[PDB]
Structures are given as C-alpha cells and as structure tokens.
C-alpha cells in the first residue's frame, strides 16, 4: 500500500558522481547520455504522484561502467526536490540538502 514519505539520503552521502550530476543540471549540461533530461514517468508510484512532465531523469555515472548503468538523479519541480536511485529505478531516496 501507500506510504506517507520517501526515505532520505544525505547530500554528503551521495557518490561524488551524483554531485557532478546535480551540477550539470544547474549548468544545463553538457550531458553524457542521450536520455539525460527526458521526462520520468514514475510508473511504479515510488515518488509522489504528479502530472507527466513533473519529473526528469539524469545519469549519475558509475565509475568504470562501460554503459550508462543503474544510477540516476530524478528531479521534481519543488525547491530541493531531487531524488537518487542506484538501482535502475527499483528504489529512490530523496536528497536531504541539510546533511
Ligand atoms: Li537541481
């Protein structure tokens, strides 16, 4: 069933590549993978339900991966509403910018 909140991961605990990603989003790129910036549909309902176009996804590079890999940042529309998945969207944690 439904749950009241997504869990959290401290900004300081993210891998450094995720910090790089957040910076690339701020700077508008350049993005390493062609699917960077696409709309994320949130089809499994792991993140709060919103209309199509609320969320976008961006690669977080996995060191030594010859392919895109499993890590991503998903951005929401609200201030500081960034989510991290390290497992191809099987789970997310909301980035806590205060720690
Ligand atoms: Li951002």
Curated annotation (Swiss-Prot):
Reactions it catalyzes: [RNA] containing guanosine + H2O = an [RNA fragment]-3'-guanosine-3'-phosphate + a 5'-hydroxy-ribonucleotide-3'-[RNA fragment]
Single annotated GO MF: RNA binding
Recorded GO CC terms: extracellular region
Organism of derivation: Kitasatospora aureofaciens (Streptomyces aureofaciens)
Active-site residue numbers: 57 (proton acceptor), 88 (proton donor)
Keywords assigned by UniProt, alphabetized: Disulfide bond, Endonuclease, Hydrolase, Lyase, Nuclease, Secreted, Signal
EC number: 4.6.1.24
Name of the molecule in the record: Guanyl-specific ribonuclease Sa3
């Amino acid at each position: 069933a439904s749950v009241k909140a997504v869990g959290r991961v401290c900004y300081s605990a993210l891998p450094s590549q995720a910090h790089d990603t957040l910076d690339l989003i701020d700077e508008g790129g350049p993005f390493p993978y062609s699917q960077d910036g696409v709309v994320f549909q949130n089809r499994e309902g792991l993140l709060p339900a919103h209309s199509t176009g609320y969320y976008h996804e961006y690669t977080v590079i996995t060191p030594g991966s010859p392919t895109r890999g499993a890590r991503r940042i998903i951005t929401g529309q609200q201030w500081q509403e960034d989510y991290y998945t390290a497992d191809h969207y099987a789970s997310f944690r909301r980035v806590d910018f205060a720690c």
